[PDB]
């Protein structure tokens, strides 16, 4: 009836994909299944998964899928009667959560050597336990928060003042410069964002990202792979404990 929210019609040049992209994913998985011999299942648990473009540019000659897990599970076939190959329905239990496929004509030993040598320092992301305690120095705050030496540092942009205040830093504008208390220091004590060995929340994650300090490590973890020739799965070490489907 009446008394309802008014949803805004956005002036947007892109609309909702829906079944067009759904069928494009479906046909893509069908055309990808027979081309390449091995289908790896990998997982990204709590990462910002933005380095997938770099790993794709590295594996130009391999095709990685990371989309909707239930769509990909049915596309590979969760039952013995809809499967392209005999045992892809075995792989559709390793396909459980924030997981993806990776189709190759390359060798396992090489691919897990790659994925064990791959690791990139990235931003915290919610849920991670803080490996250290970060506290911005008392005084004029810079664009680093007392990690880089200040003598080689740049003052922070003044347009983040409302955002830092919203996230909860008692910061002020003195003569165009963002500061904690007084410009010459003293005044008050510092502001700690997160303490070591303590679960960090979304507010703390946003503060960390704005100050551009990374506290987490991005590494893709392989749950298990599939070889179509022998028609066999291979539980990878990680997949052992991961809540299978």
């Amino acid at each position: 009836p009446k008394s309802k929210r008014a949803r805004v019609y956005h002036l947007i040049q892109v609309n909702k994909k829906g079944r067009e992209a759904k069928e494009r994913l479906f046909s893509n998985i069908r055309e990808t299944i027979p081309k390449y011999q091995h289908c790896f299942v990998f997982s990204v648990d709590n990462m910002r998964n933005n380095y997938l473009k770099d790993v794709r540019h590295e594996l130009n000659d391999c095709r990685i899928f990371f989309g909707k897990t239930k769509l990909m599970a049915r596309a590979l076939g969760t039952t013995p009667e809809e499967e392209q190959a005999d045992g892809l329905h075995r792989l559709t239990r390793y396909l459980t959560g924030t997981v993806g496929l990776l189709f190759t004509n390359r060798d396992p030993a090489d691919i897990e050597s790659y994925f064990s040598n791959l690791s990139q320092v990235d931003f915290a992301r919610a849920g991670t336990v803080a490996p250290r305690t970060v506290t911005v120095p008392t005084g004029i705050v810079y664009s680093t928060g007392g990690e880089v030496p200040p003598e080689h540092d740049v003052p922070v942009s003044h347009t983040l003042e409302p955002e830092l205040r919203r996230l909860g830093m008692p910061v002020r504008m003195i003569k165009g410069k963002v500061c904690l208390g007084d410009e010459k220091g003293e005044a008050s004590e510092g502001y700690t964002i997160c303490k070591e060995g303590e679960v960090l929340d979304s507010r703390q994650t946003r503060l960390l990202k704005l100050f551009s300090i990374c506290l987490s490590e991005f590494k893709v973890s392989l749950l298990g792979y599939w070889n179509s020739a022998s028609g066999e799965v291979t539980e990878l070490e990680a997949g052992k404990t991961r809540p299978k489907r």
Binding site: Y9, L11, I12, Q13, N15
Partner: peptide
């Protein structure tokens, strides 16, 4: 409010059309 609703409905239709897609003054002046 009537003027605003007519304007917003016309804007919605025009934006939908353009998102899907990918002389009297002269005589008087003379």
């Amino acid at each position: 409010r009537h003027a605003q609703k007519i304007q917003m409905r016309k804007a919605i239709k025009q934006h939908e059309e353009r998102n899907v897609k990918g002389t009297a003054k002269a005589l008087s002046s003379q």
